[PDB]
Amino acid sequence: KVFGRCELAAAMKRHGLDNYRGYSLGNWVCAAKFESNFNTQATNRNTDGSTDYGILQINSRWWCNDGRTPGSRNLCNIPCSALLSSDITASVNCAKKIVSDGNGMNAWVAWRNRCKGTDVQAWIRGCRL
Ligand SMILES: [Cl-]
Ligand code: NA
């Protein structure tokens, strides 16, 4: 499913992401936009053989199991395919674990290079939340 800007904003807020670990909703919507262009089905292969899945492009090297990433962990205890659903519950729950890992949202490369330091509030502007 391809989410609308405000539609996703509302969905994330309901799932407890607004201000989670100090990160305002705008940060999460910005990351989603640049990681997957709001597409829950987005998949991207990495050089090391791992693959990124879903709306927030979670990596199979450490967070989910896709059966084709040798020596990987699966810290979120879930099939990577579950991160491609129209329902973002699985992605959100796993992202909460990731952002709490120690490096915050820097774990998401696109957020660091395109969201960090910007006026992220612009991403939820005009939204009925
Ligand atoms: Cl943190
Ligand atoms: Na894995």
Is position 7 annotated as part of the catalytic site?
Answer: no
Contacts of 52 (CB under 8 A, 6+ apart): 35, 42, 43, 44, 46, 58, 59, 60
Cα–Cα distance for residue pair 98/56, rounded to 1 Å: 11
Phi, psi of 82 (to 5 degrees): -65, -20
Cα–Cα distance for residue pair 66/108, rounded to 1 Å: 20
Ligand at minimal distance from the CA of 100 is 1
Contacts of 85 (CB under 8 A, 6+ apart): 40
Q: How many CB atoms lie within 10 A of CB 23?
A: 17
CATH for 74 = 1.10.530.10
CB 83 within 8 A of CB 32: no
Q: How many CB atoms lie within 10 A of CB 61?
A: 19
- Could you tell me the distance, in angstroms and rounded to a whole number, from the CA of residue 108 to the centre of ligand 2? 17
Ligand at minimal distance from the CA of 64 is 2
Which technique was used to obtain these atomic coordinates?
X-ray
Q: How many domains does the chain have?
A: 1
Angle ∠(74,35,40) on CA atoms, nearest 5:
70
Q: Are strands 43-45 and 51-53 parallel, antiparallel or unpaired?
A: antiparallel
**Dihedral angle over CA of 78, 36, 27, 49, nearest 10:** 50
- What is the resolution in angstroms? 1.9
Coil, strand, or helix at residue 61?
coil
Cα–Cα distance for residue pair 119/121, rounded to 1 Å: 5
Residue type, 90: A
Contacts of 75 (CB under 8 A, 6+ apart): 62, 63, 97
Cα–Cα distance for residue pair 115/47, rounded to 1 Å: 24
Q: Considering 7, 18, 48, 52, which one is annotated as catalytic? A: 52
State the residue range of the domain holding 52: 1-129
101 is in an annotated binding site: yes
